[PDB]
């Protein structure tokens with residue numbers, strides 16, 4: 001068993017990905033080589049990759065896509081890339097064509113969890129509560145059924161880029177133009193205030209298992225929630241996970257306001273440093289970091 | 303401008319991909335090259351690709367993916383692959399990484415439109431009428447909130463393979479078993495009877511224009527126009543669905559008409575393209591000649 005870890009990426013989460021890679025490389029219980037996608041889209045192999053890792057950021061790459069990589073030398077690929085060209089299903093589509101088993105959600109799941117509008121339409125139809133929202137498409141004026149404040153976001157970007165809180169309708173047009181700077185589609189959802197952010201990890205292929213619930217405020221593991229609400233969080237996370245057909249893992253984020261839960265999004269490739277929420281959550285669930293990585297690889301083969 | 307046409311594929315529609323590719327080449331108003339993906343997954347380039355088109359099939363190829371192809375000499379890529387590794391977003395995803403403009407639906411819309419279960423969830427949520435249904439995954443006992451008869455089918459496949467009609471609830475298990483032979487997930491929906499199958503094509507990015515409506519008819523063929531009394535309603539539903547799903551380039555949308563009630567069945571992101579295929583013909587009757595259709599499709603990939 002030899003594993004290929006791909007880190008970096010052209011997205012803003014480029015340095016975070018390399019951090020996660022540092023953590024995975026030191027604990028994965030399998031011979032593993034690193035491949036880095038520089039911020040310019042080019043790749044770095046072997047030594048140059050490890051050198052880039054130490055630098056904690058690789059602005060320039062050597063080989064343009066597709067790289068002269070010896071794919072036959074690996075049994076499983078672990079795409080530890082965040083955001084665009086990472087969790088959207090493109091790298092996965094590539095790996096599919098290479099006939100390479102890999103860690104994480106497949107093309108459909110990735111592309112779908114990544115779209116804030118489509119995933120919401122699917123989850124709402126299945127009975128999973130989501131914040132009231134409306135989709136706005138580049139070129140056609142907005143129609144918002146509820147009143148401000150809103151939160152405007154690009155539908156398929158990530159890393160909070162292009163996101164803004166709108167207090168009045170008069171500021172809506174400018175918020176959409178900002179979001180459209182990154183996407184052809186945007187979402188306008190009700191701004192919850194005050195609100196609490198809860199996060200829960202899921203592991204498995206389609207029918208997964210939830211880890212304990214966490215809260216972002218500093219990460220509070222576990223979250224100070226009453227018995228019933230904690231159960232619903234895990235329950236809703238497993239339901240949405242199954243409906244979307246996610247494979248491998250996912251960190252599901254929820255908002256809690258007025259005692260009500262709303263599933264915000266499913267992150268198919270969450271931060272993976274030994275101190276990130278997903279790993280810490282499962283550590284709390286009795287699954288050590290090395291074992292977590294072992295399971296992901298095992299899941300990729302089934 | 304230089305276009306790159308990719309045809310064949312590892313799916314069971316390999317032969318038909320080549321046929322529509324033959325038609326495309328005969329009329330595409332741009333210098334165009336052909337690249338073929340054999341049934342064994344290896345790519346055939348240059349004259350070998352055209353030689354392959356000749357035989358109407360390419361069992362084996364020369365270059366294993368990724369092919370040593372000069373993508374830089376092409377402005378637009380036209381993927382004419384069907385089903386798996388065709389319209390499921392995989393090829394699309396690869397093209398997105400090569401930073402190459404391409405015809406048709408993007409990664410998400412393609413993956414989404416190929417999943418009967420997922421696209422029906424989105425459409426129903428959006429108000430678009432669909433046949434009642436439930437998803438059944440391999441591993442969980444089937445629970446159907448309605449009585450038979452009903453059709454059982456693989457959620458993600460090609461040429462209606464693995465589809466069956468169930469009259470007795472005691473025949474559901476065998477139907478699901480058949481369906482699970484092509485996918486890990488299946489759809490169980492209310493069987494419409496009698497039913498008429500309509501189809502309308504769509505061109506454009508997100509906000510498209512509908513073609514006239516045609517009606518399918520199998521002999522013991524498509525009727526353009528369709529003997530409807532409704533065509534408007536079908537076109538509105540098609541464009542609405544097209545928009546919500548965020549489809550780009552094109553799509554043939556199939557509907558079921560029963561008891562005066564319309565039901566959108568599915569959106570095909572990569573319809574057959576022979577001069578006589580349902581998509582090209584529908585648009586022809588809509589004033590969009592075959593060469594024009596191709597021209598626009600290629601230009602749309604750039605906008």
Ligand SMILES: Nc1ncnc2c1ncn2[C@@H]1O[C@H](COP(=O)(O)OP(=O)(O)O)[C@@H](O)[C@H]1O
Nearest residue numbers: 131151158159160161189190191192193195264
């Ligand atoms: N509907 C909302 N109501 C209140 N706050 C929100 C809402 N949506 C987003 N936010 C705020 O913006 C932040 C980022 O939203 P998010 O969708 O998670 O962006 P990203 O997908 O990049 O992580 C959240 O942590 C939250 O504080």
Ligand SMILES: Nc1ncnc2c1ncn2[C@@H]1O[C@H](COP(=O)(O)OP(=O)(O)O)[C@@H](O)[C@H]1O
Nearest residue numbers: 433453460461462465491492493494495497567
């Ligand atoms: N709900 C239904 N009611 C009646 N007939 C159906 C129904 N679903 C499918 N069929 C029949 O089965 C055939 C194949 O189903 P379909 O979804 O169109 O497969 P495909 O995606 O290959 O076109 C249809 O052409 C239709 O005649």
